[PDB]
Structure 1
């Protein structure tokens, strides 16, 4: 039968250096080519709250629904998650610093079709 090599779908990342004490990385699936994302990795540099938000607006974040998914302490990586967001469902992931000082946040995952 026909043999095909599967390479895995588009890499996605969001990052910010020196996120101030109460500030956040907003992971926006509008930055994806396919307009949806699945975040696997949050490497956080210091303590963070991870939050899943729905917007009232198609294009900007105006909070409708908000759920704090988890709180992470100190420096490390949460690896192998599936937290999912799309542009058309207006879903955003916010990673908020809670360290008392500036941190580097790198979030990686994969683009998903809408």
Structure 2
């Protein structure tokens, strides 16, 4: 019988302006208050590779495992993804610029419980 209103998530985003021609945005779940993230949107100002990494350290990134998820070309948005990472699992997402020049990257999603 009890009626309750549900606000449907806690917001997350990482962004960088003018990241160089081989540099990267590191989406680190340590920056989330709940320790885990689910990235839905990647808006890219040029071509990018998305890479999912595990660290061999609990806190810093030292590559244990790495997989390139997809390559996006041109300027645009990918939306409705569920790219998942957390601190206790030591998971990081790296968006790497592959344009011949600087680009803007804006990734968004929601926090998830650890």
Corresponding residue SS for 1:60: coil
In the TM superposition, residue 8 of structure 1 has moved relative to its aligned partner by 1.4
Residue 111 of structure 1, CA deviation:
0.1
Partner of 1:105: 105
Alpha-carbon distance between aligned partners in 2 of 1:9 and 1:90, rounded to the nearest angstrom? 22
- Number of matched residues? 114
CA offset digits 1:26-50 (Å, max 9, x no partner): 0000000000000000001000000
Q: Offset of 1:95 from its aligned partner?
A: 0.2
Partner of 1:30: helix, strand, or coil?
A: helix
**Secondary structure at the counterpart of residue 40 of structure 1:** strand
Q: Secondary structure at the match of 2:22?
A: coil
Which whole-Å CA distance do the structure 2 matches of 1:50 and 1:97 have between them?
A: 9
Given the two structures, how large is their TM-score scaled by the length of structure 2? 0.99
Unaligned runs of 5+ in 2: none
Secondary structure in structure 1 of the residue aligned to 2:88: coil
TM-score between the two structures when normalised by the length of structure 1:
0.99
Q: Which runs of 4+ in 1 moved over 3 A?
A: none
Q: Measure the CA separation in 2 of the matches of 1:10 and 1:59.
A: 23
Name structure 1 gaps, 5 residues minimum.
Answer: none
